[PDB]
Amino acid sequence: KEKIALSRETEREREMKEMGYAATEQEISLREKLQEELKWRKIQYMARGEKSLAYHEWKMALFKPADVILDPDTANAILLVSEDQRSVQRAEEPRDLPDNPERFEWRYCVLGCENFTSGRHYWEVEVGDRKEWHIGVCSKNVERKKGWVKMTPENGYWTMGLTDGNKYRALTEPRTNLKLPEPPRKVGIFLDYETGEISFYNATDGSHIYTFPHASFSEPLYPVFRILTLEPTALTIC
Amino acid sequence: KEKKILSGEKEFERETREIALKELEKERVQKEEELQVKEKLQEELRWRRTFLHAVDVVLDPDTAHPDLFLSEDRRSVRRCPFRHLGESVPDNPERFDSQPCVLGRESFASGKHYWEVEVENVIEWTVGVCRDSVERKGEVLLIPQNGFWTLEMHKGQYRAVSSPDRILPLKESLCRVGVFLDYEAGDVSFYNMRDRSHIYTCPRSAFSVPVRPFFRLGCEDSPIFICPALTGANGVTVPEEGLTLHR
Amino acid sequence: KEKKILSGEKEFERETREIALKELEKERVQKEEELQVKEKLQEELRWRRTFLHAVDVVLDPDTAHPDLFLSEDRRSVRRCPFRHLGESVPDNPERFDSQPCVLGRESFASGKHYWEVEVENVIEWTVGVCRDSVERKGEVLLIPQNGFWTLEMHKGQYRAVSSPDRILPLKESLCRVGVFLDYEAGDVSFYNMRDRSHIYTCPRSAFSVPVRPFFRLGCEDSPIFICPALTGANGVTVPEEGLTLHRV
Amino acid sequence: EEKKTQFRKKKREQELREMAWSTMKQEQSTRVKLLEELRWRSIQYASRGERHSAYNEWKKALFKPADVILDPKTANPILLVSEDQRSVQRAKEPQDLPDNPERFNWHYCVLGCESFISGRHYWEVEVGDRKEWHIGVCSKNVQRKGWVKMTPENGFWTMGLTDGNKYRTLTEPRTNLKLPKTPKKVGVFLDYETGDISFYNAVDGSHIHTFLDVSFSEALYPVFRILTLEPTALTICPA
Numbered sequence A: 001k002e003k004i005a006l007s008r009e010t011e012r013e014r015e016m017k018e019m020g021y022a023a024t025e026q027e028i029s030l031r032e033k034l035q036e037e038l039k040w041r042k043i044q045y046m047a048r049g050e051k052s053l054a055y056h057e058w059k060m061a062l063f064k065p066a067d068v069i070l071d072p073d074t075a076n077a078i079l080l081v082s083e084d085q086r087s088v089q090r091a092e093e094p095r096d097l098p099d100n101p102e103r104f105e106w107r108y109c110v111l112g113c114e115n116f117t118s119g120r121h122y123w124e125v126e127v128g129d130r131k132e133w134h135i136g137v138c139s140k141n142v143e144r145k146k147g148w149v150k151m152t153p154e155n156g157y158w159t160m161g162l163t164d165g166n167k168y169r170a171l172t173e174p175r176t177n178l179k180l181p182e183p184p185r186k187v188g189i190f191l192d193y194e195t196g197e198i199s200f201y202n203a204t205d206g207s208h209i210y211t212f213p214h215a216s217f218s219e220p221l222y223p224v225f226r227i228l229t230l231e232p233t234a235l236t237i238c
Numbered sequence B: 001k002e003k004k005i006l007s008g009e010k011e012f013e014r015e016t017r018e019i020a021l022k023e024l025e026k027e028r029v030q031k032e033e034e035l036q037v038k039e040k041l042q043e044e045l046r047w048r049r050t051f052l053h054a055v056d057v058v059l060d061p062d063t064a065h066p067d068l069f070l071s072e073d074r075r076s077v078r079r080c081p082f083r084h085l086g087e088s089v090p091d092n093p094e095r096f097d098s099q100p101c102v103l104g105r106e107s108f109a110s111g112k113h114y115w116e117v118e119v120e121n122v123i124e125w126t127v128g129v130c131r132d133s134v135e136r137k138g139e140v141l142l143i144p145q146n147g148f149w150t151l152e153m154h155k156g157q158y159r160a161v162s163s164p165d166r167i168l169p170l171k172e173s174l175c176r177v178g179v180f181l182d183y184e185a186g187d188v189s190f191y192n193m194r195d196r197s198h199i200y201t202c203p204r205s206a207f208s209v210p211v212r213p214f215f216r217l218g219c220e221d222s223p224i225f226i227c228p229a230l231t232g233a234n235g236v237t238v239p240e241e242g243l244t245l246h247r
Numbered sequence C: 001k002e003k004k005i006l007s008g009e010k011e012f013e014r015e016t017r018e019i020a021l022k023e024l025e026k027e028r029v030q031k032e033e034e035l036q037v038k039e040k041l042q043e044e045l046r047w048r049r050t051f052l053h054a055v056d057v058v059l060d061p062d063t064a065h066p067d068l069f070l071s072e073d074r075r076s077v078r079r080c081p082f083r084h085l086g087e088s089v090p091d092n093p094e095r096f097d098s099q100p101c102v103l104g105r106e107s108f109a110s111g112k113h114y115w116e117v118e119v120e121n122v123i124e125w126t127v128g129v130c131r132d133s134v135e136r137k138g139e140v141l142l143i144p145q146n147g148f149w150t151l152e153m154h155k156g157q158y159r160a161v162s163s164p165d166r167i168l169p170l171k172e173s174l175c176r177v178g179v180f181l182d183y184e185a186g187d188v189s190f191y192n193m194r195d196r197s198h199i200y201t202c203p204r205s206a207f208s209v210p211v212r213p214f215f216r217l218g219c220e221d222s223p224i225f226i227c228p229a230l231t232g233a234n235g236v237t238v239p240e241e242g243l244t245l246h247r248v
Numbered sequence D: 001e002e003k004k005t006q007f008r009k010k011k012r013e014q015e016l017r018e019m020a021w022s023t024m025k026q027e028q029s030t031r032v033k034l035l036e037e038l039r040w041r042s043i044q045y046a047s048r049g050e051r052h053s054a055y056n057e058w059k060k061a062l063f064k065p066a067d068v069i070l071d072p073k074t075a076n077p078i079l080l081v082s083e084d085q086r087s088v089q090r091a092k093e094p095q096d097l098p099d100n101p102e103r104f105n106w107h108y109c110v111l112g113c114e115s116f117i118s119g120r121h122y123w124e125v126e127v128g129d130r131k132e133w134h135i136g137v138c139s140k141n142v143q144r145k146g147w148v149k150m151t152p153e154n155g156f157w158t159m160g161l162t163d164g165n166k167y168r169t170l171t172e173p174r175t176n177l178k179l180p181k182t183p184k185k186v187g188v189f190l191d192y193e194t195g196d197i198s199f200y201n202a203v204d205g206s207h208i209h210t211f212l213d214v215s216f217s218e219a220l221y222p223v224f225r226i227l228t229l230e231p232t233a234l235t236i237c238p239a
């Protein structure tokens, strides 16, 4: 009885050691994940000094890639969404569509199917030589019927628009115009729901364009694309 | 008797300890005295290390190109028109073959020195410093990456380290030129000895080996003169009336 | 029992002996290295003074006359009338009050030295070497009897140690003058610095006392300049293109 | 007899269990420390934070303040050090001081007193309206007798201003910096394990320069360098 007791105590201590080692492994895994994120952010900030080619690598790490598919039920009458539900082109006349509360009566906006409850996300849209467009995100609780809701970042809309190809200005108060010497052909939008941050970047050379003020979110958002001028150049999502 | 005989050597062990201790003692005192004398020598060197020296250079006929004519005092050279009609000069490893250049005889490794050269009525010439370990057989390029720090006159213009993109904007013709060397700072400077005006200073570079003077003559039948150091009145008699206008 | 303890301590005693031998060989090798460095030191000292030394002369203002005006870099002197009046100049035991003379700051004991002076358009000047134990309070004749070895210009003629029977037959105006000193041979010489030609050599004598430079300025408002030694490019920055045409 | 061997094995394996738990505890502490540190890093990098709402905060959080004292035993005989050992000045003529083997005989540099082995430190220096200065860090086994180029390959990490308008960093070959403002105070930050040296502007918060990705294998000292005679001195702000 003594020998078997010593043996079973030995086995119990062995189990103690092995689960201690398992917890050690999970802890070092968490620590190493934190280290990777820290270094990624470090090089992200250091590159933001002047410029770099690192732009199209770090987003593969920090934020998860996008598969954005448009929702035709949210598509306005004067905009026609391609069959892929990926791109939309402004149409001459509002087609025959029944009234939809999700559809902006005054705004020419299209919302996507999926919902961005949490996490961090991004997406690029090509503009090429676009003459006018507006890009961003908006919430469900906002008003989609009245046309008197002005463009402020505190009504649920985080958006900015390019007009004439020479004012790349945010939709805030006052009319904040931002100077950009090189007219880009592909722009990236970055969303961080946890910290409520919106970043507006140029997907050509990693040039910073715009950072929204630190306003915390309260509701999942939806993509917003606004076209008020009919131009042959269109918008495509990648 | 094992205990007694094995204890008999404690006196020997004590004696060995004793001799070792006294040896340590005289070692201590001797090294202290030597350190004192060394400190005195170091103090004298520290006082004497901040002086400028004026040198006198005598040319070395072992490194001279076979087509150069040196005066008997070895203080002037000329480039002669194929004087080798019946003259043989053997090719030792230290003799230039494709370049008309001459070297000095003294090697410096510390301190500051300077000397003067007269280049009046000459057309193309080169004056500077060079490392003693430079290739001397075959055509070479006089570039600081090979060990040459020179100043030259070429086609009526004054050239730096022989890059053709940094001509110097001098205002008159140069008659007397001074070369100044500071070894611990990597300093080589060229001066004009008429106003004592600074002309040029090359970028600093570590020598790590002794350096020697370097002269090159590019024209035909024209002499260069090295100004001798001031000697005073040695080797001569000074009468009570005094020595006036000595030649 | 004492035998086992004796054996146990004997091995320790024998083991502690070699401490002496590594101490000894370490001492020997260090001594060899020190002797090598000392001999290198002595050889470079022997390679030291047998040369010519170009000196940097700076004047000291505690020997000057209450009438001379000095520059702020202590390298120029002029004679000005009724400018220091009303300013209390201390009466030092080393002050000149008979003749307008200034002395250098350095004393010499052995070796060869030389320096240069700029006398372009001064009308009456005297330059030379004086013992630092000369009379400073009295009108002492500037002759080699009291310890002055000088050269001067007086009323348009260049003259020697100031005996009026030693007129130097010069052929051109003097613009820069060189002074040379050799302690071992008792040699003091004066040179013309345009073509480095010899002017005069004083009769041989023994100094036995440290000597100093000596300047005396006559009735003239023109200053005299002492040429500074060549410095090169110390205290300045050198780019990768080089330093060209440097003016202070 | 097998009972005794089982007892011995039980004791040894219990000691191994104890060591496993100790390793676990160090791992957990390291994790929580890294999490808080990453939060502080994020708020520091968050934007071009320049309205003083972060600079003081992240400087007091992620870097410890160091007291720097100048020692006369290293200064070139040209330099003068105050009685507080805080300021440096240049004299007209060199002094007469012994040639100890820890003095800069050719260069115009003065070193600090203490060394840095590991950690994160910072200090602040007042440059005023001077026209020429150079500051940085240097190794311990650097060459002090003679002329050596001030280069990271020789053990120097420095930067500064010359000519009254030219800002530069001392590399091979030298590079030019383009600032839109005139710095009046400079903050120097050092991180050892990462290998980061940072120069910042301490009046507003703009960023001047950063030496990164360097493996230090020895100890580091603060280093200052001046070359001109001015009525303004180099002050070290106390903390």
Ligand SMILES: C/C(=C/COP(=O)(O)OP(=O)(O)O)CO
Residues within 6 Å of the ligand: B204, C234, C235, C236, C237, C238, C239, D106, D107, D108, D149, D150, D170, D174, D227
């Ligand atoms: C007298 C001065 C020496 C500067 O030499 P450098 O030519 O190396 O100047 P820098 O390019 O700034 O390193 C420091 O004592």
